[PDB]
Design a binder for this molecule. Structure first.
Ligand SMILES: [Mg+2]
Ligand SMILES: [Mg+2]
Ligand SMILES: [Zn+2]
Lengths: 81, 49, 246
RNA sequence: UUGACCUCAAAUCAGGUAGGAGUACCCGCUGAACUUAAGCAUAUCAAUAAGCGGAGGAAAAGAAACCAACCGGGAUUGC
RNA sequence: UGGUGAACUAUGCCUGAAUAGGGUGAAGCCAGAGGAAACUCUGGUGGAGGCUCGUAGCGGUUCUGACGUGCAAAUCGAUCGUCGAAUUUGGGUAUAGGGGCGAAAGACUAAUCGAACCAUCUAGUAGCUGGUUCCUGCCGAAGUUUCCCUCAGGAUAGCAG
RNA sequence: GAUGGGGAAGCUCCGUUUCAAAGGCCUGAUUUUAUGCAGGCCACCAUCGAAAGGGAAUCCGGUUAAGAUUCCGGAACCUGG
RNA sequence: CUUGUGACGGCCCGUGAAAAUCCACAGGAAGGAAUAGUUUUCAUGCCAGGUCGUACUGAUAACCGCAGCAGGUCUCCAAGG
RNA sequence: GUGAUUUCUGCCCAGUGCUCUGAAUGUCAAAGUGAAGAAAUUCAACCAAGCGCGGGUAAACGGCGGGAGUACUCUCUUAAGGUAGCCAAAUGCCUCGUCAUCUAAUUAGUGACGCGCAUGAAUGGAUUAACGAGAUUCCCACUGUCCCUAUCUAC
RNA sequence: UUUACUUAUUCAAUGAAGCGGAGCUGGAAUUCAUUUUCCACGUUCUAGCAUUCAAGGUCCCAUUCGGGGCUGAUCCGGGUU
RNA sequence: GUGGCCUAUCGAUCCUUUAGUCCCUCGGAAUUUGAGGCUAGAGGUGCCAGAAAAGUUACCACAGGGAUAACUGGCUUGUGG
């Protein structure tokens, strides 16, 4: 009974939500996220996972400060009014 | 090369234990048969004469 | 081939010793000043059972000579020690059972136990139940003592090493048959995970050197060289002789 | 006793700086096998892919412990 | 090559929990009797055992029953093994892929195991199988020679344009 | 599972009291006063880990379409000050 | 009958957690009364008790098995013959 | 490794392993030493462990035959040749072995026999109470398994 | 080419507490002139107790509430052993 | 008369080595060792136009094959009848 009766015993999560990415990939016993690598300082990325890099790279979010850097450069980082 | 090993592992030993261990390892029979082979080496010359 | 069972034992994942119900390391009192210039008197408060150990332990209380407090040491109980007995530890201690005299100050034929190898490691030799060390001879110049160990070996150790006079309590245990796989289960359940033992000749050849074949047999000789490597040392390692002697 | 020197510390001491992201191109380390040899082990793939460390608008290199053998040339880079 | 899994399951640890009613009647003890003494006998008491019949529970022997495009990628029915422990089990925790764990079947490691899964190298290689897209006109074969780890393949000569 | 350390080219690995100068505790004293200087005490030595282990203290009656040992009425208890 | 508990008895080469936390004792540091104090482990009296969860199912239809699947999934209460 | 108890575990160290505190130039690396050379280099001596020589070891892996003579003895092979036990056994080709028993009839079962293709002693041998969803034979009871089929209910 | 040495290196313990040398004070000791040495150098019927820079002695201070130094508890070398 | 009366009686590249020329080269210039070349032999591939090479799989896998076995059918009929 490795199929249907064994699927009834599944009610204990191995992963919960992660703090940096909100992914539900944070392993409870390992205390590590399997997608972004929290709590390591570097973010988990691999050159074989180029599509995953495309999924989580810069520009897939809000760019709350980086949207204005090109415009401030074009104006020359001016000050005043 | 043999004398290093006796200093390494047989420094603290007495002759009762030494005789017991060589009798249990069978080297004493080899020493006996080597001296015996010397005895028939002399003895065959004596029988020839 | 796979990694064999005795090869897997050294990682210590499930092969660590079960130490939940143990009462502390049974060591001798440290050799400070009193034990090497005079003696010191302590008291046996209780004799207790140690989990996973065949011998009982003794909880001996001394007074700290430098601070107002009490020290509690765990000794291995000698056969004949009772609760409320005064235990004397030191160079000038009288020769009675339970006292912790150094080996330089006991005569010929003395039976001691919990013997230090070097002076100060707080007990190494003759600690299992019913075992003892006999003093075989002294050597004052180059101050050493010869001792007979429970294995029958004769060691030459320092005369400043200490030992508890008498034999370890709880002797004669292994004379009783266990009679039951349940009894062996409860015996090893508090020691470590080394039981039950599957024979390697009953395995598959991926799992052991002895495994495989259309009959259960070893194949090559079971005597293994000392220069063999891990994964090969399964059998009788470096056997000088085999068989039942008569 | 007092005052130096040397060395080593402590401060939510005064002021600073490093980490992470990106990584097409750049500077290094580490490092395969599929494949080809009509098999295969040196070889090849390849001083490559994957992995790790570190920069900039370029980086690196760069003003000879050079090339030459000629009636000698003259930093580096690229075609 | 680099990562992800012990939510199933294997094993150890830590902390909890669960297990009707019967049968047999072990030590210890009490009374009576006998004996010269050792000690024996009889009647009770007591309630031991990896004992036994048998529920809940755990498992899965047979019908090679049902079903077999099923209720179900392993179930249903009857018959069964076991049922106070080497028992069953929750949660926490540890062990990760030539590695783990195994009362040992090459078993189990998320329906995947005589080496898991994911992505990349990778459009891996194939003397082997299958396919290969409009018309008309003209010419029109070979299965033979020699060499090859050659015998389902090539080179070379021949035949053809 | 950090730190002190020690490996590792490195991502990181070991170790958890270790070859560390590892800290805070009460009385107060002073009443330019702030909290130093009077003192004296103590050496564990991060932290995480149980909604079934340990653990301060609440019960009854009534009430809603849907909440209650939590609201209402009454009657208690514990902790800190 | 279910359950709680007490005093016992049997078993073991099995003798069947730890820490936070609270109390007591030993000790005698120090502070202390006579026109006055000393005591808040006695009684009464005063104030405050933050944050998050709290509905419902828990299974032949609320979970997992592609589903409103005869499967699987821990536990408490338990009337009469 | 073997697998409760009882009773035993015979012979063989030649081979393959394992193991010696034996004896010591046969094999004999790099470094080092010596000679020749102008030097690169060449040639020798010396030379650690391990091999090689000498012992031990079968509850180590394993093995347990022939040929003669005459139960016995002597030879070979290769060390020793199957001891105590057990058997057409789950191990016996021939084989449906031979004898007895069981039946009307038995390639099945059981008890014996043993030149056993190719049984055999911790590769464990023989025996064994109790136990077994283990394999096999016979007997009593019992029955639609069958002679030989018929009928009824629910879906 | 054979033996010792300690500071390199290595192992172990401790909250780095009693190391080494010398000296007292006793005992043995035979001294052949005066001491050569060697052992010791506060604890053993009893499941109590042992802590407040220590009492005492002594010397200062400015007496008072007390405070400090030496000794009690032998010197010397800072090599934790 | 350019071996055996005739028809069989044998071997590439790379590497090593020998003989000859004592000839050519070691590329800044020479001498001498050393090395590399040219011409002709030898060391050998017997699977003989010339890979360096043990098994097992009843746990097995892939690409194919009726070019190829283990049924039936078909031809044959020794053998059988
Ligand atoms: Mg186990
Ligand atoms: Mg085998
Ligand atoms: Zn994350």
């Amino acid at each position: 009974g490795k199929g249907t009766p064994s699927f009834g015993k599944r009610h204990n999560k191995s992963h919960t939500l992660c703090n940096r990415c909100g992914r539900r990939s944070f392993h409870v016993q390992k205390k590590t996220c399997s997608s972004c690598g929290y709590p390591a300082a570097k973010t988990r990325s691999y050159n074989w996972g180029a599509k995953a890099k495309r999924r989580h790279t810069t520009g897939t979010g809000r760019m709350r400060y980086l949207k204005h850097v090109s415009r401030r450069f074009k104006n020359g980082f001016q000050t005043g009014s | 090369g043999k004398l290093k090993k006796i200093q390494k592992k047989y420094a603290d030993q007495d002759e009762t234990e030494r005789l017991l261990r060589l009798e249990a390892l069978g080297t004493l029979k080899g020493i006996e048969k080597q001296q015996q082979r010397k005895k028939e080496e002399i003895m065959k010359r004596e029988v020839r004469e | 081939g796979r990694v064999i069972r005795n090869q897997r034992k050294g990682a210590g994942s499930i092969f660590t010793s079960h130490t939940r119900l143990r009462q502390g390391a049974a060591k001798l009192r440290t050799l400070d000043y009193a034990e090497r210039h005079g003696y010191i008197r302590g008291i046996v408060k209780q004799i207790v059972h140690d989990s996973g150990r065949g011998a009982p332990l003794a909880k001996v209380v001394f007074r700290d000579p430098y601070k107002y407090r009490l020290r509690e040491e765990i000794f291995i109980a000698n056969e004949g020690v009772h609760t409320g007995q005064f235990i004397y530890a030191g160079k000038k201690a009288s020769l009675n059972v339970g006292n912790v005299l150094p080996l330089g100050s006991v005569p010929e034929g003395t039976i001691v136990s919990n013997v230090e190898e070097k002076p100060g490691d707080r007990g190494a030799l003759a600690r299992a139940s019913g075992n003892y060390v006999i003093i075989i001879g002294h050597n004052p110049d180059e101050n050493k003592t010869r001792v007979r160990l429970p294995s029958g070996a004769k060691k030459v150790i320092s005369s400043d090493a200490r030992g508890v006079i008498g034999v370890i309590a709880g002797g004669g245990r292994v004379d009783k048959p266990l009679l039951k796989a349940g009894r062996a289960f409860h015996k090893y359940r508090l020691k470590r995970n080394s039981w039950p033992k599957t024979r390697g000749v009953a395995m598959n050849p991926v799992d052991h050197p002895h495994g495989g074949g259309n009959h259960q047999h070893i194949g090559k000789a079971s005597t293994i060289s000392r220069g063999a490597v891990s994964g090969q040392k399964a059998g009788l390692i470096a056997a000088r002789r085999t068989g039942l002697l008569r």
